[PDB]
């Protein structure tokens, strides 16, 4: 736990007094999320409620955050590490809100170019996460975990919320580590959500949607209106065979090629 304190770079250490708290932004099992001011920046402070389960998770997040340096991934400001009562995580505050709010709450209509910029930014950030010397599976990529600047660029974050031959496929899957290709499945649903401005399987509650995708092989409808290079990314992206899904390098390259024509 203090192993983190030694391992963390100097400028990232923060004192609890150096952090000004203004409003609450969200709640979790980890604690509350504040909007505040710290180091002359408007920041977001992830504050924690000191028993083993939650602490192992605290070090994990900090360990992840001091490694991230990319314009399409959330920025770490630093963390407070004096006592467990004062454990906190400080990041940039991206003021434009979540992609979810933009699409489903504010219900805004977007330009195709507007849509493609967000998509590419998410793709760029994920390629970044997947090309770390120790690659990171996001595991929870969705429109709530994608934040937007006021200028419409976006940032990828995480709110912290036998013999095989006769085995059942749902039993086989629990013996198989999921890989980064799991993030490609998730991205593709988000990309469909951007293009259509619709929540995936909007008519269903989440667990029903998940089983329809897994057990009954339903995907969202790919209309004909959807651009040739994109719709291809979708089909392959949400393929049931993980290996059959593209790398982000390809998504980025193809989505960027589209920007040049819009």
Ligand X SMILES: CNC(=O)c1cc(Oc2ccc(NC(=O)Nc3cccc(C(F)(F)F)c3)cc2)ccn1
Distance, in Å, from the CA atom of 102 to the CA atom of 143, rounded to the nearest integer, reads 9
> Contacting ligand X (CB under 6 A), which of 158, 198, 212, 247?
158
Cβ burial of 225 (10 Å; 0-12, 13-18, 19+) is exposed
Comparing CA positions, the residue from 151, 152, 129, 154 lying closest to residue 140 is: 129
Q: Is 93 in the site for ligand X (CB under 6 A)?
A: yes
Quote the least distance from Cβ 65 to ligand X, whole Å. 6
What's the token pair of residue 113?
């170019």
CB atoms < 10 A from the CB of 257, how many?
10
Distance, in Å, from the CA atom of 236 to the CA atom of 242, rounded to the nearest integer, reads 9
The helix (H) or strand (E) run that includes residue 89 is strand 88-92
Q: Is 46 in the site for ligand X (CB under 6 A)?
A: yes
Q: Is 129 in the site for ligand X (CB under 6 A)?
A: yes
Q: Is 99 in the site for ligand X (CB under 6 A)?
A: no
Q: Is 147 in the site for ligand X (CB under 6 A)?
A: yes
Q: Is 182 in the site for ligand X (CB under 6 A)?
A: no
Residue placing its CB nearer to ligand X in the complex, 16 or 25: 25
> Contacting ligand X (CB under 6 A), which of 28, 66, 84, 97?
97
Cβ burial of 37 (10 Å; 0-12, 13-18, 19+) is middle
Question: Catalytic positions, please?
Answer: 140
Q: Is 126 in the site for ligand X (CB under 6 A)?
A: no
Binding mask 197-236 for ligand X (x = CB under 6 A): ----------------------------------------
Comparing CA positions, the residue from 123, 135, 132, 160 lying closest to residue 145 is: 160
What's the token pair of residue 108?
């805004």
30 is in an annotated binding site: yes
Quote the least distance from Cβ 46 to ligand X, whole Å. 4
Judged by the rule CB under 6 A, the positions of this chain that interact with ligand X are: 25, 33, 44, 46, 61, 64-65, 68, 73-74, 89, 91, 93-95, 97, 129, 136, 138, 147, 156-159
Binding site members for ATP: 25-33, 46
Binding site members: 25-33, 46
């Amino acid at each position: 736990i203090l192993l983190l304190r030694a391992g963390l770079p100097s400028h990232f250490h923060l004192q609890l007094s150096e952090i000004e708290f203004h409003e609450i932004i969200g709640s979790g099992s980890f604690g509350k999320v504040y909007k505040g001011r710290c180091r002359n920046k408007i920041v977001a402070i992830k504050r924690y409620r000191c028993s083993k389960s939650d602490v192992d998770m605290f070090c994990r997040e900090v360990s992840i955050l001091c490694q991230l340096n990319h314009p399409c991934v959330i920025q770490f400001v630093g963390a407070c590490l004096n006592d467990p009562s004062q454990f906190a995580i400080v990041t940039q505050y991206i003021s434009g809100g979540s992609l979810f709010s933009l699409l489903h709450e504010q219900k805004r209509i977007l330009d195709l170019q507007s849509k493609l910029i967000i998509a590419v930014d998410v793709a760029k950030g994920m390629e970044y996460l997947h090309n770390l010397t120790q690659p990171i599976i996001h595991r929870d990529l969705n429109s709530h975990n994608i934040l937007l600047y006021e200028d419409g660029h976006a940032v990828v974050a995480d709110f912290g919320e036998g013999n095989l031959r006769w085995m059942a496929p749902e039993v086989f899957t629990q013996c198989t580590r999921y890989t980064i290709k799991a993030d490609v499945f998730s991205y593709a649903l988000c990309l469909w959500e951007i293009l259509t401005g619709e929540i995936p399987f909007a008519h269903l509650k989440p667990a029903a949607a998940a089983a329809d995708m897994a057990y009954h092989h339903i995907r969202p409808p790919i209309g004909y209106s959807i651009p040739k290079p994109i719709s291809s990314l979708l089909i392959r992206g949400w393929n049931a065979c993980p290996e059959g899904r593209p790398e982000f390098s390809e998504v980025v390259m193809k989505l960027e090629e589209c920007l040049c024509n819009i």
